[PDB]
Ligand binder design. Structure first.
Ligand SMILES: Cc1cc(S(=O)(=O)NC[C@H]2O[C@@H](C)[C@@H](O)[C@@H](O)[C@@H]2O)c(C)s1
Ligand SMILES: Cc1cc(S(=O)(=O)NC[C@H]2O[C@@H](C)[C@@H](O)[C@@H](O)[C@@H]2O)c(C)s1
Ligand SMILES: Cc1cc(S(=O)(=O)NC[C@H]2O[C@@H](C)[C@@H](O)[C@@H](O)[C@@H]2O)c(C)s1
Ligand SMILES: Cc1cc(S(=O)(=O)NC[C@H]2O[C@@H](C)[C@@H](O)[C@@H](O)[C@@H]2O)c(C)s1
Ligand SMILES: [Ca+2]
Ligand SMILES: [Ca+2]
Ligand SMILES: [Ca+2]
Ligand SMILES: [Ca+2]
Ligand SMILES: [Ca+2]
Ligand SMILES: [Ca+2]
Ligand SMILES: [Ca+2]
Ligand SMILES: [Ca+2]
Lengths: 114, 114, 114, 114
């Protein structure tokens, strides 16, 4: 299945935060309605935050996360979870090699804000 | 039910990160095997990161998140999600008032690291 | 927090299924837009299905699960999870006593159907 | 990533339940520690329960779900969620064709029982 694609409510503020756990330099691309609106590039093996931004989901509400290392796409896994019928998490893990820890770039999307 | 309590595998490195979305100053306490090992304090209405740390789950693996605002315990909601049978998220929302957005402090715990 | 309350898309078919794991007879009430539309009653300590139905979420999309044993309300825990940005689960556990297994009645709501 | 594979605690009773939502007849295979221990078969476009069983996770705790339609493997999506640090759901969706609803067979694994 396609992974890393989420339908948010339209015209809604959301946060996106990426963590790195890999020897490879992670490039996280955030697309809103098929346009790149944020890019984080960084490296850590200690869960360092490579970026965090507030964005708007726009008319279509489509948010897509892509992760690559040195131009090669990582394999993605994702899910959305809702707590208290209001607090939303859209979660992405990614794997750049063969150890299958899926933590090489970890991306958390959260809404609502404020 | 009790919320914000998670059993991690023993002696395992994990990340903990907190975001704020409230007029109130949030105080997030992280306990590992019933000892306070991190405290994050801050205020934001725009998803600022008020803290992020790497910790070890120790012999018992017990991790508890507490959130308080101006001396009062916030109401917590929580769940753990596992992707690809390997990548773990322990998620906490909290509510300091009556609007029930449960985003006033948002806490994400993730493992494995590295 | 309030638990067992979910907002579904309006006017949408969904399934609801209840399992029992308790010495006590479980009463599961399913409310759609604040009206009880199904009641499942049964007893099992081995995960028997005490009820399953297909229902419609109506204009407001509000679905609420209540669980009681001999007229006394059980304590609830709940979350919603979405896979492949399409497949939805709304999950409820409940506790009728003090062992905190939260499996005494387990309720799974799923959509879309068809 | 591999999907539909879950590590349960060893030697633990669990429930597995499957629903169908497709014109195609679903065959759900349940493997425990790499041995087939249950097969559920049926055809419904209205969320019929095509099987429910109680099984034991054995020494290794490995549970795998496979889904096929007339001999052809469906594409799987999956995740595990834990509520109240105790109640576990292992969730599978599957897609037999081109609409990407991922509901064609839906499988819910739950533990603990009793
Ligand atoms: C410079 C690059 C190294 C790799 S890799 O294939 O070795 N993958 C990085 C691995 O780093 C380990 C320390 C560990 O975190 C493992 O999970 C990770 O996949 C590149 C692709 S680029
Ligand atoms: C200085 C403090 C104000 C409050 S409060 O009860 O008003 N709660 C804060 C509320 O802030 C809003 C901007 C919004 O984020 C809302 O969700 C939040 O509960 C204190 C408790 S302390
Ligand atoms: C006949 C009744 C017994 C109880 S109870 O309070 O003892 N709770 C039932 C308990 O049953 C156990 C077998 C186990 O499943 C436990 O988790 C459950 O809470 C009534 C309330 S009525
Ligand atoms: C090319 C293929 C067609 C089928 S099918 O005819 O069995 N249809 C499967 C579809 O049934 C619909 C009613 C709907 O539930 C849809 O989601 C489902 O995939 C194949 C098995 S392969
Ligand atoms: Ca890796
Ligand atoms: Ca890694
Ligand atoms: Ca609030
Ligand atoms: Ca708030
Ligand atoms: Ca109980
Ligand atoms: Ca029980
Ligand atoms: Ca389909
Ligand atoms: Ca279908």
């Amino acid at each position: 299945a396609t992974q890393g694609v989420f339908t948010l409510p339209a015209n809604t503020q959301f946060g996106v935060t990426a963590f790195a756990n890999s020897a490879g330099t992670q490039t996280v691309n955030v697309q809103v309605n098929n346009e790149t609106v944020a890019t984080f590039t960084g490296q850590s093996t200690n869960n360092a935050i490579i970026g965090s931004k507030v964005l708007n989901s726009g008319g279509g509400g489509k948010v897509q996360i892509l992760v690559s290392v040195n131009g090669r796409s990582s394999d993605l896994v994702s899910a959305q979870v809702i707590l208290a019928n209001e607090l939303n998490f859209a979660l992405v893990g990614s794997e750049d090699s063969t150890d299958n820890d899926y933590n090489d770039a970890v991306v958390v999307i959260n809404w609502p804000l404020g």
